Design a protein around this nucleic acid. Structure first.
Lengths: 193, 48
RNA sequence: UCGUAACAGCCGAGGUUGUGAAUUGCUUUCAAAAAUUUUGAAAAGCAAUUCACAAUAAGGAUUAUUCCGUUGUGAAAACAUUCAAGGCGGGGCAACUCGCCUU
């Protein structure tokens, strides 16, 4: 890079380690609470949290726990900013492939996992903009090739998530408007699906 | 301050109501040399 | 979408060390003096306020109104730089500087 492009790159990387610090602090707070399970060093669950905490860029926001997002260490034990962050940031994030809020505890459950917008049998992107998380059922049914035909052919299908709970695939009539406006964050990635 | 002289550089600033607010700051040479140089030149000119 | 950002150039005012000087200071040393104590002269060391001046990376060239000396290469104790002419023209009383056209 040139000097001008160099001076900025420090900001993104430093924010990245700040986010990593926050992620592991949040997990160290979570292992004390019986959400589902928390091992310790398991990297994939850390990545899942790193992809699930993006609800801040999803429209609605409040300034109370806004300094907690930009900070890196927080207070972890007992009555702490991490606790209130967990309370507010507990369900304000809907599933991309079912449009249902996630209590953030069912993430580690095998029923929900990381979803690749672009398949492995295709373009080899590894950037965070080509990574989401949703149910295991839709991950199994995605069948590599993405969107169009299949997403319109299977639209409206009802799939059981186990234990008697069945969820419906997006009705394309509503899902067109959803993939047009609902994910209003719309940085660069939703339209590529 | 009693019966003693002080060295300041005054930055005149006229407010909305016409009040020229006089702001005093400690003078330190080698940085704000423009004002002291102009003062010395004015003093030399005055003496003719 | 890269690149430009780096390299250079004309100057200023201090400070420091030191030399000389004016004026005072502190300490030390023979007593010169007084009736065991002080006044002391003169020198030495250390300074203070102010002035003039020398040096300002060790040092080496040169007499051009030129410098080299904190960069890089690498042993060769070796180097890097510059590159003829012809007018056209701008600026500047001047020294000189800056552009265009042609082999």
């Amino acid at each position: 890079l040139p000097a001008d492009d160099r001076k900025k790159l420090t900001n993104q990387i430093t924010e990245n380690e700040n986010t990593n610090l926050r992620i592991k602090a949040l997990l160290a707070e979570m292992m004390n609470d019986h959400s589902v399970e928390n091992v310790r060093p398991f990297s994939p669950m850390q990545q899942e949290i790193l992809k699930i905490y993006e609800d801040g860029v999803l429209k609605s926001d409040i300034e109370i726990e806004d300094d907690i997002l930009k900070i890196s260490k927080t207070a972890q034990p007992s009555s702490s900013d991490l606790k209130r962050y967990k309370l507010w940031l507990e369900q304000k994030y809907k599933s991309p492939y079912t449009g249902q809020i996630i209590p953030l505890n069912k993430l580690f459950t095998p029923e929900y996992e990381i979803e690749a917008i672009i398949p492995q049998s295709r373009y080899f992107d590894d950037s965070f903009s080509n990574k989401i998380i949703c149910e295991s059922a839709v991950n199994k049914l995605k069948d590599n090739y993405i969107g169009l035909g299949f997403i319109k052919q299977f639209g409206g299908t009802i799939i059981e998530l186990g234990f008697g709970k069945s969820v419906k695939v997006f009705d394309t009539e509503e899902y067109e408007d959803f993939v047009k406006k609902h994910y209003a964050n719309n940085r660069g990635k939703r339209n590529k699906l | 301050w009693v019966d003693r002289t002080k060295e300041f550089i005054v930055s005149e600033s006229i407010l909305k109501n016409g009040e020229t607010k006089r702001t005093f700051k400690a003078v330190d040479s080698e940085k704000d040399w423009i004002a002291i140089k102009t003062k010395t030149e004015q003093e030399i000119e005055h003496s003719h």
